[PDB]
Amino acid sequence: SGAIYVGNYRVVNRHLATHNDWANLVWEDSSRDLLVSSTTAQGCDTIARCDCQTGVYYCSSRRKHYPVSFSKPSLIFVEASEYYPARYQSHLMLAVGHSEPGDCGGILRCQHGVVGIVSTGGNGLVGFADVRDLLWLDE
Ligand SMILES: NC(=O)[C@H]1CCCN(C(=O)CN2CCOc3ccc(Cl)cc32)C1
Ligand SMILES: [Zn+2]
């Protein structure tokens, strides 16, 4: 679980979105595993606009933050679940670090702000859905 609150928006993993999120839907993309919904309260999370490949993510399964080196956003294949069939997930970044089901929604941040959220992992890896290209989150 976990979300990004920036201005009048809430960014969550699309597979974890609520009925309220869908009733106030702004944009969603199954290929990215993202959904953005509108909010009445003001969010103060700052989104990074950069090409950083180092950052710190929150890992709920360890209740700890971990520093990581991560790859640049790309199309990477993902297995199958009660949420999606076998597919390539776009705008995905990988890092060597611990993650297990339940860690989705954990924020990844660099010195510039919020980079993305945990969306997949396994075998000593962790995958993050990038949000740095969604320039409209800020205006
Ligand atoms: N982005 C997706 O398609 C996700 C949707 C939820 C399910 N997905 C998983 O990867 C589930 N899973 C299995 C392997 O071990 C893991 C370790 C860390 C994490 Cl965060 C998830 C998993 C795909
Ligand atoms: Zn940065």
Mapped to the 3 state alphabet, what secondary structure does the chain carry?
CCCEEEEEEEEEEHHHCCHHHHHCEEEEECCCCEEEEEEEEEEECCECCCCCCEEEEEECCCCEEEEEEECCCEEEEECCCCCCCCEEEEEEEEEECCCCCCCCCCEEEECCEEEEEEEEEECCEEEEEECCCCHHHHC
- Of the candidates 45, 59, 103, 104, the residue annotated as catalytic is 104
Q: Are 28 and 75 in contact (CB under 8 A)?
A: no
Q: 11: closest CA among 126, 95, 89, 128?
A: 128
| Dist. CA 121 → ligand 1 center (Å) | 6
Q: How far apart are CA 135 and CA 137, in angstroms?
A: 5
Tokens of 43: 């969010």
Separation between Cα atoms, residue 57 and residue 137, nearest integer Å: 21
Distance 47 CA to ligand 2 centre (A): 9
Residue at token pair 């992992």: 121
Whose CA is closest to 70, among 119, 33, 105?
A: 119
C-alpha span between 130 and 114 (Å, rounded)? 9
**Experimental determination approach used:** X-ray
